[PDB]
Amino acid sequence: PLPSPPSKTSLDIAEELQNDKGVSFAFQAREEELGAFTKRTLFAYSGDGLTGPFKAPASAELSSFLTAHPKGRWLIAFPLGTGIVSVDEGILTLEISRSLPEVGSGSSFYLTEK
Amino acid sequence: PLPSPPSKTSLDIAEELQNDKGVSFAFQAREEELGAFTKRTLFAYSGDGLTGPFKAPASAELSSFLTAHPKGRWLIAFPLGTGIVSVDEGILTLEISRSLPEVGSGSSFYLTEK
Amino acid sequence: PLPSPPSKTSLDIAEELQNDKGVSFAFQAREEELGAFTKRTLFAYSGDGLTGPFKAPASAELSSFLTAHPKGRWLIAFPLGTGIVSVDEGILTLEISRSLPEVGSGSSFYLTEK
């Protein structure tokens, strides 16, 4: 009874990153298009604790997705703190508000008509 | 090996709202049906900071979706604070727990067998 | 222009749980497969407040999904506090960081290449 515009998933990729200390993250990058809008979502998960910023090489494809954000960085909520994800010259950085004894999972999206 | 009931997406719409001060939000309203259940999710994003409640006219369709919530309001977590979204006579209000230097993104859902 | 591996939703189920005091939760369990990766997401919603841990019998299927987590428990963010979901002998427990006047909604996922 309420109508919808057409929609599709135009990107859905995942990648595992690991830093020099053996901490590992999985990231998923998703793009949905719906009508005039595009939504890009970053999902992040680690089983590990994190005692400082997480830095690791990212693929060209993930790097492209991450750099597209209108602010060049992704504010992300995890259960025990906040992070910021950004990429520079193919290196992902996740900066954190506080040490995280468990990172858990979170997501960050932007949704635009541009 | 674990079975699922049938499911579908019965609604997926998005809309851009802007207040008198030039702050802009994108909202997405999604309905999933799975077996006996219906899940309605509100996604919200702004690149802007928010220095007080956000108020703006919403479409009839978005207003209908928002008013359906069993509490008549949507509790929503953003990375830096909490909000409540409600609608009255076609005007959306997002009230916030604290000033937000960046709103970022968040979602709020309800899931029911009714 | 950016390629994706194949993906599908391999599980999507929902269930309503109720404790001895009449508090009720809806849980949704979803599995996505994308390329090498599997993502398992638990969605949780209650309209009720919660004044202590929520305990209730869960189906064998939900119990199976919950026990699969690499930590045997799911750290979950709600708007007003944090929880941990686990299952033992078919009884779900949601432990909470603080009393919640409204639980609202939240989700917890893990994403792995195993």
Residue numbers in the entry:
A (entry chain A), B (entry chain A), C (entry chain A): 232 to 345
Reproduce passages from the article.
The SnAdV-1 fibre head is the first Atadenovirus protein structure to be solved at atomic resolution. Despite the low sequence identity with other fibre heads, the topology of the beta-sandwich is identical to that of known adenovirus fibre head structures and contains ABCJ and GHID beta-sheets (the E- and F-strands in the long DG-loop of human adenoviruses 5 and 2 are absent). However, it is significantly more compact, making the 107-amino acid long SnAdV-1 fibre head the smallest adenoviral fibre head structure known.
The purified 171–345 construct protein crystallized in space group F23 after a period of about one year. After structure solution by molecular replacement, it was noted that density for residues 171–231 was absent. Coordinates and individual atom anisotropic temperature factors were refined at 1.33 Å resolution, leading to excellent agreement of the model with the data. The first is that there is no room in the crystal lattice at the bottom of the head domain to accommodate a shaft domain; the second is that residues 232–234 point away from the three-fold trimer axis and away from each other, instead of downwards towards a potential shaft domain. The electron density for these residues is clear enough to make this interpretation reliable, while the low refinement R-factors suggests we are not missing a major part of the structure in our crystallographic model.
